[PDB]
């Protein structure tokens, strides 16, 4: 139409192409699949994945499209990715699992979803932190409770020798911190 | 009525072992070294879990609001990556530096564009961020906006001084990113914006 006349023959040929040239659209830091997922473009994510794309490809920091969908709480995209056999067991550059990320961002639906896909709820990163350690750090009683209900082990220690309760003792005396401590001390007793 | 706090504090202490009690009383304020690791920075975690008051407590007790992690990211970077917009605006009002580039040369504006946070983008303009900041590979926010196929954000960057003749390290214009997807990716609309805007 208008601006199309401003294009060279080579550029017009690109515009009319039936398949994307993804090499142009990609860098080590910004992967088009990751970007589309991170900003919530579900239909476009699905379109890209219908071409020749590694669904498990990593950015310069070792994260996959699943990390990006999870961190941004893009729930439908996260479900879709797993449904399309994205690898749920990927680790980041410090040995943390997707569950660690789902917990940090306080996403109960993703936590549940990851468990259905056989996530180890007690997995430790390089520093020995479990998802429960992260939930405690977040002071999110709702998330802590969910993890406990789903069988998280309160006795797992990080490299400093701290259980999630132990970690709680260092977080600072404050109401939200007390509520988590109470959950941690009381929950095992509610098991018969 | 913070008698609830004293009541709750007592309830919890009654549950603790003597050894746990000693540690608790020794740590009225958060113990930074004990509660932080490589992957899990308290400000970042609290930001992503929407714990604004707890963030303020950490900061007011001496933790730098622009404290960086292993990837030179601050809580602001992470809050944006998580698209936690109420936390983002809180941090900015508290004086979080919106100009800082992380390890990959990425600024808050880069990430706000990547997660498609239009309101955060508009807010960053008000703090006079450099909208043409280039990362380690020469990518600007305009490049990422076009990659995300977002017409609104592409347009607003151009209206606010985004440079459409800035090339990545391997010579790509935002125009190239618009064209390369071919049909059915809003490519023509993006090209049109890039050929006409601004003015």
From Swiss-Prot, chain A:
Swiss-Prot/TrEMBL ANK repeat ranges: 28-57, 61-90, 94-123, 127-156, 160-192
Tissue specificity field: Expressed mainly in chloroplast-containing tissues. Also detected in roots, stems, flower buds, developing siliques and dry seeds.
Recorded phenotype for the gene knockout or disruption: Plants show a developmental arrest of the embryos at the globular stage.
Disulfide cross-links: none
Subcellular location: Plastid, Chloroplast
Induction (UniProt): By light.
Record's signal peptide: none
Self-association and partners: Interacts with EMB506. No homodimerization observed.
Function in brief: Involved in the initial differentiation of the proplastid during the embryo development and in plastid differentiation linked to cell differentiation, morphogenesis and organogenesis during the plant life cycle.
Name of protein: Ankyrin repeat domain-containing protein, chloroplastic
Naturally occurring in which organism (per UniProt): Arabidopsis thaliana (Mouse-ear cress)
UniProt lineage: Eukaryota, Viridiplantae, Streptophyta, Embryophyta, Tracheophyta
Residues of the full protein shown: 232 to 423 of 435
Swiss-Prot record, chain B:
UniProt ANK repeat ranges: 38-67, 71-100, 104-133, 137-166, 170-194
Highest taxon above the source species: Eukaryota
Entry keywords, A to Z: ANK repeat, Chloroplast, Plastid, Repeat, Transit peptide
Subcellular location as annotated: Plastid, Chloroplast
Gene responsible for this protein: EMB506
Record keyword Magnesium present: no
Purpose: Involved in the initial differentiation of the proplastid during the embryo development. Also required for correct cotyledon, true leaf and cauline leaf margin development.
Organism lineage string: Eukaryota, Viridiplantae, Streptophyta, Embryophyta, Tracheophyta
Tissue: Expressed in roots, inflorescence stems, flowers, siliques, dry seeds and mature cauline leaves.
Subunit structure comment from the entry: Interacts with AKR. No homodimerization observed.
Signal peptide residue numbers: none
Primary site of residence: plastid
GO CC entries: chloroplast
Name of the protein in question: Ankyrin repeat domain-containing protein EMB506, chloroplastic
GO MF assignments: molecular condensate scaffold activity
């Amino acid at each position: 139409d208008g601006p199309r006349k401003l294009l060279s023959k080579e550029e017009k040929f690109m515009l009319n192409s039936r398949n994307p040239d993804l090499a142009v659209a990609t860098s080590k830091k910004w992967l088009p699949l990751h970007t589309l997922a991170a900003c919530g473009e579900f239909y476009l994510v699905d379109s890209l994945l219908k071409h020749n794309l590694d669904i498990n490809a990593t950015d310069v920091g070792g994260l996959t499209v699943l990390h990006r969908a999870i961190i941004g709480k893009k729930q439908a995209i996260t479900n879709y990715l797993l449904r399309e056999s994205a690898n749920p067991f990927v680790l980041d550059d410090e040995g943390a699992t997707l569950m660690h990320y789902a917990v940090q961002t306080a996403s109960a639906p993703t936590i549940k979803l990851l468990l259905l896909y056989n996530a180890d709820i007690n997995a430790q990163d390089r520093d020995g932190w479990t998802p429960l350690h992260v939930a405690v750090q977040a002071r999110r009683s709702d998330i802590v409770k969910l993890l406990l209900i789903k069988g998280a082990d309160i006795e797992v220690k990080n490299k400093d020798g701290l259980t999630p309760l132990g970690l709680c003792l260092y977080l600072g005396r404050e109401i939200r911190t007390y509520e988590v401590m109470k959950l941690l001390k009381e929950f095992p007793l509610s098991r018969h | 009525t913070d008698n609830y706090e004293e009541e709750l504090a007592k309830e919890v202490e009654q549950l603790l072992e003597p050894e746990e009690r000693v540690i608790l009383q020794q740590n009225e304020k958060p113990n930074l070294k004990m509660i932080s690791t490589k992957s899990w920075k308290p400000l970042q975690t609290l930001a992503l879990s929407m714990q604004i008051q707890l963030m303020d407590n950490l900061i007011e007790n001496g933790l730098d609001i622009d404290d960086v992690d292993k990837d030179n990211q601050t809580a602001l970077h992470k809050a944006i990556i998580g698209k936690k917009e109420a936390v983002i605006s809180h941090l900015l009002r508290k004086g979080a530096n919106p100009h800082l580039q992380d390890r990959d040369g990425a600024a808050p504006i880069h990430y706000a564009v990547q997660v498609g946070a239009l309101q955060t983008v508009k807010l960053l303009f008000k703090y006079n961020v450099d909208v043409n900041v280039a990362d380690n590979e020469g990518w600007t926010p305009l490049h990422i906006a076009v990659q995300s196929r977002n017409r609104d954000i592409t347009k607003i960057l151009l209206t606010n001084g985004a440079d459409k003749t800035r090339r990545t390290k391997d010579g790509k214009l935002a125009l190239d990113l618009a064209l390369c997807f071919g049909r059915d990716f809003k490519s023509y609309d993006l090209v049109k914006l890039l050929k006409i805007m601004p003015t």
